[PDB]
Amino acid sequence: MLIFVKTLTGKTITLEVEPSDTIENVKAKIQDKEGIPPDQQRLAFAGKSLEDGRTLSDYNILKDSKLHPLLRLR
Amino acid sequence: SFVGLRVVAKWSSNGYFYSGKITRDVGAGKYKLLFDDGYECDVLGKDILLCDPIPLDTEVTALSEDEYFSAGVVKGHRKESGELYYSIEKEGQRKWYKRMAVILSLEQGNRLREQYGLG
């Protein structure tokens, strides 16, 4: 599933994820693509924090394929 | 010539096109772009659409209030205080979006390349 992530620099990247991805895995994917260590990453979707210890499915964000959430780093 | 023009441009093979402006022609078919969100990088000319505003009835991808990007169709634009807004229809409903909330998928931008691509 396609998601977007807006970094602190203003750049927006894409990733592919599934509802089963852990937040830590999303952070590792951001590191892998953009070079930002997970320890610097604080993710949010629509103003709610996405926390370590959880999966994307826990936040009920990913619906069908046409909706591509924008996560923001803060 | 192209310097200072508003464009929509992508920086990866299969990437999305984002709004920005050309700040320099650096040769070898590359241009320095300042994207509207603040990101600056060199981008290939083949990946630049010299299209501003995006024309009526273009399929685009737009960031709604709810923080999802999804496809919609441009139905109008308006310029206010130097900022551009698009009226975009999604699932039959129009809303107003800032320019920087409107991007193009690879496929959506490829539809504009013959008319509006640089070069």
Author numbering:
A (entry chain B): 1 to 74
B (entry chain A): 1485 to 1603
Which sentences did the original study use to describe this structure?
An alternative way to improve HDR editing rates is through downregulation or inhibition of key factors involved in competing NHEJ and MMEJ pathways, such as 53BP1 and DNAPKcs (NHEJ) or DNA polymerase theta (MMEJ). In this study, we leverage this functional screening system to assess focused libraries targeting the protein-protein interface of i53, an engineered ubiquitin derivative, and its binding target, 53BP1. Using targeted saturation mutagenesis at the i53:53BP1 binding interface and a screening process in primary human HSPCs (a cell type with intact DNA repair, DNA damage sensing responses and other cell stress sensing signaling pathways), we identified i53 variants that introduce stabilizing interactions with 53BP1 and are more potent than i53 at increasing HDR editing outcomes in HSPCs. Using these classifications, we determined that the addition of i53 variants results in an increase of HDR by specifically reducing NHEJ events but not MMEJ nor other types of outcomes, consistent to their role as 53BP1 antagonists.
B Residues targeted for mutagenesis were chosen by their proximity to the binding interface between with 53BP1 and i53 and are shown in red (T12, T14, L67, H68). We first screened individual and combinatorial saturation mutagenesis libraries targeting two adjacent i53 residues L67 and H68, located at the binding interface of i53 and 53BP1, and identified amino acid variants that were enriched in the GFP+ population relative to i53, in particular variants that introduce a positive charge at residue 67. To understand the molecular basis of the improved activity and binding of the de novo i53 variants identified in our screens, we solved crystal structures of each variant bound to 53BP1 (S2.2, S2.3, S2.4, S2.5 and S2.6). Crystal structures of i53 variants bound to 53BP1 Tudor domain. B Zoomed in view of the complex at the solvent-exposed loop preceding β5 for i53, L67H, and L67R. C Zoomed in view of the complex near i53 residues 12 and 14 for wild-type i53, T12V.T14H.L67H, and T12Y.T14E.L67R. All recombinant variants complexed with the 53BP1 Tudor domain and exhibited increased binding affinity relative to parental i53, suggesting a correlation between the improved affinity of the selected variants and their enrichment in the GFP+ population in our screening platform. The selected i53 variants outperformed WT i53 at all loci, leading to 1.5–2.5 x  increase in the HDR fraction over the no protein control.
